Design a protein around this ligand. Structure first.
Ligand SMILES: *[C@@H]1O[C@H](CO)[C@@H](O[C@@H]2O[C@H](CO)[C@@H](O)[C@H](O)[C@H]2NC(C)=O)[C@H](O)[C@H]1NC(C)=O
Ligand SMILES: *[C@@H]1O[C@H](CO)[C@@H](O[C@@H]2O[C@H](CO)[C@@H](O)[C@H](O)[C@H]2NC(C)=O)[C@H](O)[C@H]1NC(C)=O
Ligand SMILES: *[C@@H]1O[C@H](CO)[C@@H](O[C@@H]2O[C@H](CO)[C@@H](O)[C@H](O)[C@H]2NC(C)=O)[C@H](O)[C@H]1NC(C)=O
Ligand SMILES: *[C@@H]1O[C@H](CO)[C@@H](O[C@@H]2O[C@H](CO)[C@@H](O)[C@H](O)[C@H]2NC(C)=O)[C@H](O)[C@H]1NC(C)=O
Ligand SMILES: *[C@@H]1O[C@H](CO)[C@@H](O)[C@H](O)[C@H]1NC(C)=O
Ligand SMILES: *[C@@H]1O[C@H](CO)[C@@H](O)[C@H](O)[C@H]1NC(C)=O
Ligand SMILES: *[C@@H]1O[C@H](CO)[C@@H](O)[C@H](O)[C@H]1NC(C)=O
Ligand SMILES: *[C@@H]1O[C@H](CO)[C@@H](O)[C@H](O)[C@H]1NC(C)=O
Ligand SMILES: *[C@@H]1O[C@H](CO)[C@@H](O)[C@H](O)[C@H]1NC(C)=O
Ligand SMILES: *[C@@H]1O[C@H](CO)[C@@H](O)[C@H](O)[C@H]1NC(C)=O
Lengths: 393, 120, 97, 437, 120, 119, 438, 120
């Protein structure tokens, strides 16, 4: 004779998707205003096997949506460059022809007066028209609205910790060689993820986490995470020492450009150590053999400028100092949106960055799966029912 | 720690940490939704414990008999050699039926207490 | 304020000695008892409520404003004779027994 | 005998209340009503329960009206505002004989310093003369309102939606098949969500609605008040097949940085009149049954279904959205009949197309419906009518009824006439013989 | 079913108190207001039950005597020949009076229970 | 705590008489009080003294003003110009007036012994 | 010994706290402050309670400031933006004799291919010369800012505003009639809502405010710091009767598809100067009493009142919203005196009217206040006064005071100075002799 | 009145706890945040009294002994002189410590109750 007994506090959970909030120790500091745990706790769950799937992880989709929303809200209250889209009279500034000095007739704050203004554009920002070869328009002029980023709003990525709402928990896979799918036999429970840097790139993954033991290749040879021996530190620079200029295109709407360049014009570039890259490629091939314009270049945000580097000296080898030229682009469609673009105004002085290569994409959300692959969100269900011999009075 | 005994047998859990962790309270739409949902989950669990006569307890004994249809295993193989995950997830899909029976029993008990003047 | 009352010495019997009052001290009342040549000890307090460290069977009937003594604990050893007190005002106490 | 107050929580009682309802579907409606519906929704029949309903005081209709207007207003914000087109148009007749014109104008295009002469096709109802030269036209009310182009990828297609009450509230439904929309109902059930309702917009005939289970039911707040709308709910639908036979080829002209105006570049084949085909036998039988019921309501009276009173096409004609095109059909071959009660037992309606419309009668706002390429065909079910009775007939033996009702609420009361929202009051007290302790 | 007993007698409907209780707790601004309001109404009733000595109960007796002016019907006519809707319609202008009397009784009860603990 | 007995200090007729409890418990922890333990009579409490003097003297003995220093842990009382009425023994008791738990001014929790300081 | 912890819930204690207060009332303000106040609101006097107040650090002022700015910004969003009017104006003088100009301009109207020549009436303060040609003006600031029309159906008339605490919080009030704004208050009461406050905007004189209960009270954060505002709360008001005598006929110019610009089409009768009348005897007595109170903080000094040191009309003139139009009055006849303390017992101020107003010192934004037809009259009560003391003026046995304070918080700080928001903490513990029964 | 006893001694103030308990219990984006916060504060107090063995009572006696380190004053010199505003300052630095001890005591009590289940 068994009776129903209700137990509250049962250590069980089920898969669930909920809204996660972010915390951090600038758009990211403003958005992720919740402070982090100064000494985060983690509980190892012994004798627990949990199935993970990094390609069905809704934390990646939420991270993506939060990034798109934050970029849209950050650029929304900023100057829209619609007074432009006029024929430009461009003369070469110089490698020669990469930067042009373009003049144009723009209506200023007063609607009765036209002014002849000058601005500096990169070859990638303008499209030639007519047969004069000095008549140009902005590359995205007739298809999109180009919004100038506010000069006081920084998009520099900082570590972001994703935290579950109370009542939910994040399970972490502690198998250092886990391939991103299937059962994990060393599972721990955390409230917040590690610090994830929302870095945006197209080929090489810069900054972020590193594999604890060896290079791990995850697919289904697609996403490669570099072992404890960090891959090449990549030193990228824009040597052209610029002086920022500002003109007005309407009441309260200032357009920023480059007024002059001090010294000689030089090409932007990135320096990758040759021996370390050769060792990285060798180790990647060893692991691969166990199983057997904007989309052909390495894009990244360096100092606030958008670099497009020619990654052809890195992936031109056959198996069993490397200076990559880079172009700088100002008018971009960062998220491939229809009808929208950002102008990303130029920064004066010179720019130098030093980034850590942590992984590779061979053959977007894939830039972040490489960080969130070890986490899943579950819902806690503390109410359980089981038979006992005890009966209520 | 929290869920530390999740891999232990059902009779070995003896946990209070997982309810302490449930004392949820110790642009702006997403935070309001998260806070409202946390409140709703707290209140729903408290409501269920209330209507079952289980408020304030972690182990609540009821007067509903166990039906072998739901599970025909003996206690020797339920509280030992099995975890709470396996019990609740793989061999228990009668949760709503059992809850309804618990609620009916609690309501019958309270009405019986009101009707029987020897308790009044 | 007054607390005159009927009484008799304890003699292993179920007492029913009613107390008088100047006010309807339904709860503002207490009972205590003392053996001959001994200090008193509380038998009941707040009318019906039993005194601490005493048998519940020895508590007074305490029917609110018509409170009266009681002794279900009608032991041969019940040497202590009860008296009531009115807590409501002026420290009025019964002489009783 | 002594009794004490006992508190009961969970008492099955309610009171009338107005709250905010949410929506569950199953483009604009699927996006707005972003709540999955329950498979096999539950309904509880309340036995021995009588509840008073009033379809003309139902705040669910007011909420549906506000939600529809809000959804239309929000849906048109992120898309082209047609202000550069409020210019003199040089229009020439195509091919009828002036219904559609080929209009040319001087407009600044996607490049700020470039002006071009461009052509667009407009319907006669969308333009007005500027001067006495037979060539200069202007867009209708473009100088007094902002014309917003309908968002090209946003489909304003009516789909079934369900209105759902929040927790603590319930929707009561009247299940009397011949209920006249007011007074007590003795076949009452409780639901959480309403049935599927299509937000169809029309001015005279109710399309794609619910049919009566057993008979045509005619409802009016006050039948002797000639100022009230009479809603006729049919028990059998009438098929109406509406076609726009012109094989329009869509053209897209750019007027700014991704700001494009959509028009018709050419028509392939000839130009023909849009029309709707209503079966004559079905309509005649429908009118026979409607007049029979009206005679029951209006004893021994001759009923004449005269056409509408005249004036602006928005009220005079039967309008509807057919595949994104807005049709205005004369609807004069329907009605225009005299019935005496002693009777026993295709119709092709011409239609006009209007691209610039103001559905919600807003001041300073209008919408431009871009043309849809190819031929357009719709087949709708007429499930009811809105009739208005003429006044001044109190001393005669003949009553005059015309198509057309009141505002848009009349098109939603025809579905939300059996539902009311109530608030649950789980607490109550009662005497019993058991005292606390 | 939910409100299935609405047309049943007061006695019979008292067997369904949990059925309605489970349904009390369950753009953008409108949905947050609907959920917050539902929580506020739930808590309003739970607080009122907590002012009274009725927390955690479906049926809660009190020490307040029934005043014949509110209703002079027999217990059988109320519980077996009347529905809860009819009862609420009859006791429409005594709800606040009864609630205040219950609160006063609970305050007196708490005052009497706070003291005389025998502990000190 | 220890229910310390009242001390006796007998006196000549028409001379002051006094008693003290020498309580083991801290005087400031409870509302210690004195009563007139007359033979064949009610307790006839003199004053429900508070834990820090400020005694609420009984109307029957309104002239009583029992008080003592808390440092001495010894509640005390005295009768000025004591006479035959002083035969009633001076009883020590602790009122059941626990701080912020009860508001009684009688219902003595314990009695010790009374000092038959007759005069 | 033998003591145990006992938990008490409902403990009458509180701690300093900040939160968001809701607005109650009994039009922008009527629309926003939709919550009705309680009839017959209660106040509980707390006996034997001393509470420290600091009017200069009171977060209620910061909230009122943010709420006022937010409403002034939000109510002008769905309204006409006057960007087509940043054009060259001819501005032939209309007059006096130059205060109001009749400005003609070429503006494209609601039809995009039709340009019209329109006429509008502007005040001298609303326009700036463009070139050496005298007949060439543009709007006062359409270079860097967007001018939004006041939106004639939106009324900004100040009404009583009650700030109310949310549940769990309470507002403590200081009932000391001569409280100096800082330090302990020994007569403290608890309220749920503040008294009604009118959000009147002014730069020098505080209009339609509260009066002191018994005496004029002069408050300052630090009376020896020349950088702080001195707020004078009067115990008797002085009426100021303001008139705009021109009989205006309003005209509507259509600038876009449903966007109309409102101006004055014609003025009927003669052109007259706007002005305000302050009774001379009442002002002289009020100022005398102010000096009597100032001499208590600045002992045995001569008290000298002067006009402000100089700057734009928004800084040196007394500005206010009268009848819906913004007046800038030359308050030089009120603060031009020398007092020694032994002086025992109609002033007409000329005023200008301005239409392009940069409120709240915003960057890149301005409001255009359209004219109101007919004549404007109002009568306000002067209830307080903002003074600034000249720095670097010591060692001469003289103090010089000038009208004008700091930013708008000083006006709102002239009210809300007797109130503070506290959070209620009903839970606490204490020892007793009982132990939990188990 | 509300907080009327704030200047009263702790003893007298403890007799009017219902004034503050009743005032506090019976409680676009900014308005929703205010409503959610008020709900969260109510529930926070209920959760704290819940984890303590104090729910449903205004005065809850615990099993935690008083430490002379927190305050070495006698009861008369606490309850009949100081007000609650002063008391909550004197031991402010020990509030969290005391609260933790109370929770720990309840946990031990729960274990002692768990050891003795009904009919087991
Ligand atoms: C490879 O490139 C790095 C820079 O990326 C060179 O390192 C710099 O060398 C110069 C001397 O030529 C130093 O002044 C700089 O300070 C060095 N930079 C850093 C960041 O350390 C390096 O010398 C190059 N290697 C070779 C072989 O030329
Ligand atoms: C990129 O620059 C970094 C420094 O910014 C170089 O790394 C440093 O190299 C020097 C060589 O003497 C070491 O002493 C430093 O300790 C290194 N720094 C760190 C942080 O490790 C790096 O080698 C450069 N990369 C290339 C490709 O030239
Ligand atoms: C009217 O009440 C009757 C009961 O007296 C209802 O009968 C059945 O109700 C269920 C509800 O789910 C339906 O599925 C059945 O089809 C109904 N039975 C029949 C024979 O029709 C009835 O539905 C109520 N409604 C109507 C419109 O009559
Ligand atoms: C001071 O000014 C006030 C108005 O500001 C004058 O009051 C007006 O006086 C005339 C007669 O002189 C009356 O007809 C008006 O009705 C009064 N106005 C008001 C508002 O009451 C006052 O007379 C002036 N004083 C002096 C001495 O000239
Ligand atoms: C499992 O994870 C824990 C995390 O602390 C780690 O210490 C332990 O070594 C891991 N075990 C294995 C087998 O990787
Ligand atoms: C996991 O299993 C091992 C088997 O030896 C056991 O010792 C250990 O206690 C188990 N862990 C838990 C948390 O139950
Ligand atoms: C309308 O079309 C349907 C098929 O779509 C057909 O059944 C019906 O008879 C047609 N009726 C008329 C009147 O054209
Ligand atoms: C306060 O007002 C009265 C008139 O009500 C006045 O006589 C008195 O002088 C004023 N006090 C001061 C200090 O000015
Ligand atoms: C202002 O007008 C009021 C109207 O009542 C009048 O009493 C007052 O004396 C006038 N004051 C001045 C200074 O004109
Ligand atoms: C305030 O203190 C006085 C003694 O100064 C006392 O009589 C009065 O009762 C106290 N007030 C309160 C509310 O305790």
């Amino acid at each position: 004779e068994l009776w129903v007994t209700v137990y509250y506090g049962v250590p069980v959970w089920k898969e669930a998707t909920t809204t996660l909030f972010c915390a951090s120790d600038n758009v990211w500091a403003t958005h992720c205003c919740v402070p982090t745990d100064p000494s985060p706790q983690e509980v190892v769950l012994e004798n627990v096997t949990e199935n993970f799937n990094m390609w069905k992880n809704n934390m990646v989709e939420q991270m993506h949506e939060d990034i798109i929303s934050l970029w849209d809200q950050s650029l929304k209250p900023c100057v829209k460059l619609t007074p432009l889209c006029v024929t430009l009279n461009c003369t070469d500034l110089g490698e020669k022809g990469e930067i042009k000095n373009c003049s144009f007739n723009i209506t200023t704050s007063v609607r009765d007066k036209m002014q002849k203004e000058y601005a500096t554009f990169y070859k990638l920002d303008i499209v030639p028209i007519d047969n004069d070869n000095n008549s140009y328009r902005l590359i995205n002029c007739n298809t999109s609205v180009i919004t100038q980023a506010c000069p006081k709003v920084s998009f520099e990525p900082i570590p972001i910790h994703y935290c579950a709402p109370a009542g939910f928990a994040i399970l972490k896979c502690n198998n250092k060689t886990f391939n991103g799918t299937g059962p994990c036999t060393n599972v721990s429970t955390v409230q917040c993820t590690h610090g994830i840097r929302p870095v945006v790139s197209t080929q090489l993954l810069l900054n972020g986490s590193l594999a604890e033991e060896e290079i791990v290749i995850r697919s289904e040879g697609k996403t490669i995470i570099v072992q404890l021996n960090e891959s090449v530190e990549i030193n990228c620079t824009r040597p052209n020492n610029n002086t920022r200029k500002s003109i007005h295109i309407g009441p309260g709407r200032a357009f920023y450009t480059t007024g002059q360049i001090i010294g000689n014009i030089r090409q932007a570039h990135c320096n990758i150590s040759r021996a370390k890259w050769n060792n990285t490629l060798h180790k990647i091939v060893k692991k691969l053999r166990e199983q057997f314009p904007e989309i052909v270049m390495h894009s990244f945000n360096c100092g606030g400028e958008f670099f497009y580097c020619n990654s052809t000296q890195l992936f031109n080898s056959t198996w069993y100092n490397i200076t990559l030229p880079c172009r700088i682009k100002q008018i971009i469609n960062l998220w491939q949106e229809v009808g929208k673009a950002m102008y990303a105004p130029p920064i004066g002085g010179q720019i130098r960055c030093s980034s850590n290569i942590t992984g590779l994409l061979l053959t977007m959300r894939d830039n972040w799966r490489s960080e969130l692959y070890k986490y899943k969100v579950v819902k806690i269900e503390p109410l359980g029912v089981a038979p006992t011999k005890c009966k209520r009075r | 720690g929290f869920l530390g005994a999740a891999g232990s047998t059902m009779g070995a859990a003896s946990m209070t940490l997982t309810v302490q962790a449930r004392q949820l309270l110790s642009w702006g739409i997403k935070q309001l939704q998260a806070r409202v949902l946390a409140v709703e989950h707290y209140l729903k669990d408290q409501q269920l414990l209330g209507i079952w006569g289980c408020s304030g307890k972690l182990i609540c004994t009821t007067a509903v008999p166990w039906n072998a249809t739901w599970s025909n295993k003996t206690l020797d193989n339920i509280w030992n050699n099995m975890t709470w995950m396996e019990w609740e997830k793989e061999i228990s899909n009668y949760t709503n039926l059992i809850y309804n029976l618990i609620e009916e029993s609690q309501n019958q008990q309270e009405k019986n207490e009101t009707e029987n003047l020897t308790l009044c | 304020x007054x607390x005159x009352x009927x009484x008799x010495x304890x003699x292993x019997x179920x007492x029913x000695x009613x107390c008088x009052x100047x006010x309807x001290x339904x709860x503002x009342x207490x009972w205590x008892x003392x053996x001959x040549x001994x200090x008193x000890x509380x038998x009941x307090x707040x009318x019906x409520x039993x005194x601490x460290x005493x048998x519940x069977x020895x508590x007074x009937x305490x029917x609110x404003x018509x409170x009266x003594x009681x002794x279900x604990x009608x032991x041969x050893x019940x040497x202590x004779x009860x008296x009531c007190x009115x807590x409501x005002x002026x420290x009025x106490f019964x002489x009783x027994x």
